[PDB]
């Protein structure tokens, strides 16, 4: 049902693009800006970022609470957009590490942890600081 609605959207976007028309989904610009910000972040802050990624190794036994503890330090005295990009890059690095160590199954678990931590901690800050649209225009 959600699956069948995504198939429809995908097909119609493809067909409209093929005929010279762009049917932009609401989050397209946000997803692009965040891919670009994460790339720039990992290129600018390699050493500092390695100090953050060194704080957590996820195994099949790991509970959300261990992830939440490390991310709570990142946001202990508040949220900013740079720390949100760090959060996304951190989750990326944990997924790459998981696949390196033949624990592919943990990628969907880490994804669910990130979505949980966004819902609980970051989305309420986002809504009072301009939304994802502000993040898009700040990254330029």
């Amino acid at each position: 049902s959600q699956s069948n609605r995504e198939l429809v959207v995908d097909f119609l976007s493809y067909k409209l693009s093929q005929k010279g028309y762009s049917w932009s989904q609401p989050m397209a610009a946000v997803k692009q800006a965040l891919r670009e910000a994460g790339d720039e972040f990992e290129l600018r802050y390699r050493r500092a970022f390695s100090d953050l990624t060194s704080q957590l190794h996820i195994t099949p036994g790991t509970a959300y609470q261990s992830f939440e503890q490390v991310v709570n330090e990142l946001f202990r005295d508040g949220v900013n957009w740079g720390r949100i990009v760090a959060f996304f890059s951190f989750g990326g690095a944990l997924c790459v590490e998981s696949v390196d160590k033949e624990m592919q199954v943990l990628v969907s678990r880490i994804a669910s942890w990130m979505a949980t931590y966004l819902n609980d901690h970051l989305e309420p800050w986002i809504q009072e600081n301009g939304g994802w649209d502000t993040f898009v225009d700040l990254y330029g």
């Binding site: 910000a37 720039e40 802050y45 500092a48 740079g82 720390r83 760090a86």
Partner: peptide, 10 residues
């Protein structure tokens, strides 16, 4: 409070 090198990355 500034704690990370990315704290002024927009």
């Amino acid at each position: 409070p500034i704690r990370y090198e990315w704290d002024e990355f927009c």
